[PDB]
Structure 1
Amino acid sequence: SSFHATTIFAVQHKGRSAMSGDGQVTFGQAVVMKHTARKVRKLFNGKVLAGFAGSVADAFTLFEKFEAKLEEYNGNLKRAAVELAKEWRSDKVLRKLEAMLIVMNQDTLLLVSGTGEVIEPDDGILAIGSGGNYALAAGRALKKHAGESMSASEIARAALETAGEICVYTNDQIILEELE
């Protein structure tokens, strides 16, 4: 069989911008090889958060094509988001690729898919990978519910946390990133 997605969660609340992801590398059906991996990077002079879901070749790889194209247009996510899609959708080797890409900036927030989708969350919460939905369900849940009572940073941390709790493919060691 294959390696399982990592779970990754981005959220944007009261103008803080945040991305949490697990470390759990779940190989095969059931086996776990590692308990920690970095797939949330900081891109472009800490201006963007991007987490990928996938293999660190694929991972690294996409990332730069997002860079390249971010410079290639001086800060416009949406634009570069797109022009990557095009690039990803077309490339033989990545077009087939399963996972997605979470990109966000100071302002705004994007799902970006092997398949050439690019998605914009109405409510400032995006989420990918194994437990995705579970954390999505945590995210949206908290924001709606203890927006005032908690933070950006915090809400995301927690997303993941809940995930690992319902979710076999998600684990307690969380990486956390925010912009300034």
Structure 2
Amino acid sequence: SSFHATTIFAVQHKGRSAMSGDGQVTFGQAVVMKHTARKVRKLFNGKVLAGFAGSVADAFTLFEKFEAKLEEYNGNLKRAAVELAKEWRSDKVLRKLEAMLIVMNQDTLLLVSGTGEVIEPDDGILAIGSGGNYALAAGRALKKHAGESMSASEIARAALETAGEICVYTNDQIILEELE
């Protein structure tokens, strides 16, 4: 695709879960078409945060499917994720997607891919999209050297701000959701 993924960051910190994302939709090398896209949402009656950085048709397809697996498996995030991955990597159309998916609940944080990966981080942080690695670095750092004086939302928010500031493909229209 000529559209660049947006940037999504997620973190669990002191009993709190947050997921932040910017809104920049770039087409081609350089042209911004939208500034405020919303690529982070709540699923399963506000019990789960989901972030998909690709197109909305692919986001909805994956959200619906993940919702159905969550019902079929009684809220078990890990199982629903593994089964989604299995389906995703065998689907002729969706498998080729570059954009990844982050799902999280109260207990755990997961990265799902179209090549069929399901990855649980070791420090409660995942990041994806064009800016994802910069936000990853900024959050990891904030949580380790400033964890005590910052929360999960202040962290998700700062990580994305740092990334907007260095990534040309990430902007400063930050959307932030938390689980309570």
TM-score tier, shorter chain, comes to over 0.9
Match of 1:176 in 2: 176
Question: Deviation of residue 18 (structure 1)?
Answer: 0.5
Q: Which runs of 4+ in 1 moved over 2 A?
A: none
Q: Secondary structure at the match of 2:169?
A: coil
Structure 1 residue 32: deviation in Å?
Answer: 0.6
Match of 2:109?
109
Shift of 1:103: 0.3
Offset, 1:12: 0.6
Helix, strand or coil at the partner of 1:95: helix
Task: For residue 15 of structure 1, report the CA deviation from its aligned partner.
Answer: 1.1
Take 2:105 and 2:132, find their aligned partners in 1: how far apart are those partners?
20
Residue 26 of structure 1: how far off its partner (Å): 0.9
* Alignment partner, residue 34 of structure 1: 34
Deviation sequence 1:111-148 (CA, Å, 0-9, x none): 00010010010000000001000000011010001100
How much does 1:39 deviate?
1.0
- Report Cα offsets for 1:51-71 as digits up to 9, x if no partner: 101000001110110000001
Distance in structure 1 (CA, Å) of the matches to 2:51 and 2:88: 16
Task: Find the residue that maps to 1:18 and give its secondary structure.
Answer: strand
- Compute the TM-score of the two structures, normalised by the length of structure 2: 0.99
Give the percent of matched residue pairs that are identical in Structure 1 and Structure 2.
100
Please give the per-residue CA displacement for 1:82-114, whole angstroms capped at 9, x wherever unaligned: 000000000001111111100000110100001
Distance in 2 (CA, whole Å) between partners of 1:16 and 1:153 is: 8
Q: Secondary structure at the match of 1:54?
A: coil
C-alpha distance in 1 between matches for 2:153 and 2:15:
11
Q: Secondary structure at the match of 1:148?
A: helix
Please report how far the alpha carbon of residue 160 of structure 1 lies from its aligned counterpart in structure 2 after TM superposition.
0.6
**Structure 2 residue matching 1:128: 3-state secondary structure:** strand
Q: CA deviation at 1:72?
A: 0.7
**3-state DSSP of counterpart to 2:41:** strand
Q: What is the aligned length? A: 180
TM-score where L is the length of structure 1: 0.99
Unaligned runs of 5+ in 1: none
RMSD: 0.7
1:64 alignment counterpart: 64
Give the CA deviation at 1:152.
Answer: 0.5
Match in the other structure for 1:52 = 52
